[PDB]
């Protein structure tokens, strides 16, 4: 299983892109100069995403997140809400909606949240589609404060189209005093996955809002061990944790419902031959695919490492300098990592969203150098 | 670390009530008390144990007695650097190198070093008979290559002003940077001393060394030290406000560190140390709490911490 | 009896957070940064709120950040009831306190005491000595941001049969010893007739009262990083030559134990709190300590910290008794509970800004104990009053 590069888009931002998701519709970007930037997914197989792309201003401090949600929910109603955290630790919401003459994007700025709530300041976020967990759409996320907030979304009150969000309710850090949450994650089972900046990790089950059990990483610090991503895969029980190690990024795997930590996704590396991690750098963000059979870790080593999941083995790898096709963890003789570092974010796009030369599913990345990058598997092309 | 040093104080302090005039019990009192700047105590302590040695050497003076006499003079010389009349630094440095410096002694030599530390200093803030100074540090360069001295002499050197000096410091720096060459404190030394030169040539040139520092020294620097400096050089050199940027590549890195979120939103610094998830001072604290700009806080500011000028103008400032 | 049980709440009883709270027989006094002194009777009968007998008075638009009341019997038939206070401005307010006839509601007297030219001062601490054979007449001592100690005698009487006319006598000053003169955050007066003054620089100064002559100074330890060590708050003990000094370690609260005959160290208040994530740390508070209370028996220090915890201490043994967790939910009214403050923080572990033990008869409660009490004052503008648990 090998990827090839469909479409790019060099400088979508003018400043860094942190984040991107996607639907199917569109493959949705933020960045630092506070600027959502709304991407086509179904694009002609010889044409420039650039041509495509709808950006929009939400805020000065910049935006660090954005996690959009896309349902057919009852009737006809084509519901698509872009969700994005800024600097400023303000949570904003977007209707997303084309015009009817000309076809581009409109954005609706939606007021979903209270006076006493959006005055704290928010962190990061995620979406929870429709599913047979319960009927209703969930929203997770996070404080500067390590507290996790989760919403219930009604798009509809008592078809009228009257969007509203409901607090479920909070959940509160494991740690006293509390640190950073960074991380947050929401499985389809119900389970929420919250991330700090020290290794810390809490697992709480949304239907009771309790806290299922937590897991603390031993390495300890002037050396940084903190959570970078968090994510459920979508078969099994499994859980993925990207964290740091002091100058490297390190993926572990986790198993909800015992508890039962099952092992780490390795790569060989030589610097003094002394040595294992995931890569040289960071792991920024991870993402599994819709099979939950490959996860992909974007790496700031400027890399792209898809892993099988069952082998616990890396499949392959992907430089974002270099178009071609052994990736030995290049690591100086310091112990710190020798790679230009490119990569903030990674999505994989289920087969049937990103259209063209539509059989095999896609991936998209944002780097350093403001470029988004889209990829499709090889069946064929 | 600190608290140890404390309690090892304290501890030495409540031995000499029982039996003082121990020459090594002193001697570790002079060191702990000079790892906590306490300098007064050592002054005293060090007067002592002065007299308690003289008074023994007077008797017997064999060379051993003279070596120990000049380490503990040497240790005087310090303690006098930190007390700032550096006139009697470069007194009693110059008895201990009178005493020890042709001794060849393994144990001396770290206790030479020690006196060159002091009189060089001593020479610079003292009158800035800056050839003094030089004609001192430059032994001391030829003394020894490791990183903290070399940043010492280089400072030195460099803040003299004199043409050649600046070019000797910045050499040797680079040189440095040159031979092990990865750690911050050489860059960013070297990012300021170039930054302020105003040298358009080496800014681009260092500003380049200083985006890519890697990410292991990137964490060393709590302080955040590296996004200034590329700030300050990118805002004026490119003159693009773009150079703000790095401090948000920062905060999504160290998402918890205080010195970030100075720069880009207040409100998360002051509520990231609100519960102690970091641990600030009295006066940062107070500072934070003024910086919400309303009356209460800066009441609460003010009364926190009653001794810095912004709470109280703060405070005035609002009526 | 070291385990205290609350007794009344009075949440939002402020507009901006109080920083001193005083009492006496007759009442609880609390001041604050709306400038308003607030009264509160400290005799209730059950189930009664607290602010249904509490009176209130303005002073000053700045604020008040320390308040002291001093009440004695003066002559075998008057009562004196007398309130001093400083305010942000560094204004010295005292006001007399009466009750009504019959209503026996308080009645404030704003008294002016002070010169034209001692006004010009700007008073931080202030505390009252009441006549306990120190010298005959009642003593007041307050401290400026020069750090300078004023030593004040208060005559309420005209020459000695007995009219109503207050007049402060300035005994004189006791000036710091150290040069440049620091910043003297707090004082004491103790029962033997002596001073302490505690500036922001970790020193203390002892100096008799009687006599306004400087006896001695001493300093705090780890003087690393300038700025970190201050004193927060100084108190002596009743009972012996004790004294407890609260000072900052930065970010970190310590109490240190001095004996006062000749002045030395004895010992240190700590327990196990947090540094450097896993490992643990010999502090009295994880945060500052902001203020001290002896018991009358002088065998329990109480300790109010920022880190919203009142943590009371064995003197004699120098370990910890037991420790009270102030939340901004312990409060009997549901609608007095300030959950998150203006900014939206939150308050539900509020810092304790104040704490006082109250001898046993001043706090009168039914079917309980004739026994000590307990009042704090906490960052959530709310004033808690306990009881200590035990027997009489």
Redesign the interface.
């Given at each position: 299983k090998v990827f090839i590069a469909t479409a790019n888009a060099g400088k979508a931002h003018?400043?860094?892109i942190?984040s991107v998701s996607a639907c199917n519709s569109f493959t949705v970007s933020c960045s630092?100069d506070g600027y959502l930037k709304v991407w086509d997914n179904k694009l002609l197989d010889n044409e420039n995403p650039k041509d495509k792309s709808y950006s929009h201003f939400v805020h000065k401090?910049?935006l660090?997140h954005v996690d959009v949600l896309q349902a057919i929910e009852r009737d006809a109603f084509e519901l698509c809400l872009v969700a994005t955290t800024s600097?400023?630790?303000d949570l904003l919401f977007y209707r997303i909606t084309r015009e009817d003459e000309t076809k581009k994007v409109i954005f609706e700025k939606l007021d979903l949240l209270d006076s006493?709530m959006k005055?704290?300041?928010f962190?990061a976020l995620k979406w929870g589609a429709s599913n047979d967990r319960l009927l209703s759409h969930r929203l997770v996320a996070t404080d500067?404060?390590?507290t996790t907030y989760i919403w219930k979304f009604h798009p509809f009150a008592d078809l009228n189209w009257s969007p509203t969000l409901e607090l479920q309710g909070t959940v509160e850090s494991p740690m006293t005093?509390?640190?950073?949450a960074?991380s947050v994650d929401i499985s389809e089972r119900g389970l929420i996955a919250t991330g700090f900046?020290?290794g810390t990790v809490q697992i709480s089950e949304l239907s009771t809002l309790r806290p299922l059990y937590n897991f603390e990483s031993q390495h300890?610090?002037?050396?940084?061990n903190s959570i970078r991503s968090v994510k459920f895969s979508p078969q099994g029980s499994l859980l993925a944790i990207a964290h740091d190690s002091?100058?490297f990024g390190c993926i572990t795997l986790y198993e909800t419902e015992f508890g039962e930590r099952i092992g780490s996704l390795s790569v060989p590396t030589h610097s003094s031959q002394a040595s294992e991690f995931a890569h040289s750098?960071?792991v920024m963000s991870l993402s599994f695919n819709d099979s939950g059979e490959t996860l992909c870790s974007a790496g700031?080593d400027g890399k792209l490492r898809f892993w099988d999941v069952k082998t616990k083995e890396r499949i392959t790898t992907l430089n974002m300098h270099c178009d071609d096709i052994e990736d030995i963890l290049a690591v100086?003789e310091?112990?710190?990592?020798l790679a230009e570092?490119g990569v903030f974010d990674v999505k994989f796009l289920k087969k049937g969203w990103r259209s063209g030369m539509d059989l095999n599913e896609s991936l998209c990345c944002v780097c350093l150098d403001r470029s988004i990058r889209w990829f499709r598997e090889a069946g064929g092309k | 670390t600190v608290e140890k040093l404390t309690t090892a104080s304290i501890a030495l302090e409540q031995f000499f009530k029982k039996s003082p005039d121990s020459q090594f019990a002193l001697q570790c009192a002079l060191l702990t008390l000079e790892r906590l700047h306490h300098y007064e105590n050592a002054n005293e302590l060090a007067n002592r144990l002065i007299g308690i040695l003289e008074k023994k050497f007077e008797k017997t003076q064999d060379e051993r007695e003279l070596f120990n006499f000049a380490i503990i003079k040497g240790q005087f010389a310090r303690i006098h650097l930190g007390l700032g009349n550096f006139e009697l630094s470069i007194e009693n440095a110059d008895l201990s190198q009178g005493i020890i410096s042709e001794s060849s002694d393994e144990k001396s030599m770290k206790t030479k070093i020690s006196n060159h530390i002091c009189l060089g200093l001593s020479y610079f803030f003292l009158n800035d008979f800056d050839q003094t100074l030089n004609q001192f540090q430059e032994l001391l360069s030829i003394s020894k290559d490791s990183k903290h001295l070399v940043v010492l002499i280089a400072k030195v050197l460099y803040d003299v002003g004199e043409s050649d000096t600046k070019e000797i410091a910045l050499q040797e720096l680079t040189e440095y940077i040159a031979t092990s060459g990865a750690d911050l404190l050489v860059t960013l030394t070297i990012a300021a001393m170039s930054i302020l030169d105003d040298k358009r040539e080496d800014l681009s040139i260092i500003l380049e060394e200083l985006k890519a520092l890697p990410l292991s020294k990137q964490i060393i620097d709590k302080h955040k030290d590296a996004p200034y400096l590329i700030e300050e050089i990118t805002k004026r050199l490119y003159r693009n406000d773009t150079g703000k940027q790095v401090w948000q590549r920062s905060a999504y890195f160290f998402p918890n560190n205080l010195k970030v979120w100075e720069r880009l939103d207040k409100n998360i610094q002051r509520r990231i140390a609100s519960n102690g998830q970091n641990k600030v001072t009295a006066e940062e604290m107070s500072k934070l709490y003024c910086e919400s700009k309303n009356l209460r806080s800066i009441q609460r500011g003010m009364f926190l911490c009653p001794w810095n000028v912004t709470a109280v103008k703060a405070l005035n400032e609002c009526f």
């Open positions: 003018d400043a860094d942190f630092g401090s910049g660090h600097f400023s630790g006493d005055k704290h300041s962190w500067v404060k390590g005093p509390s640190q950073f960074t900046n020290n300890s610090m002037n050396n940084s002091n100058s750098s960071w700031w100086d310091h112990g710190d990592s570092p | -």
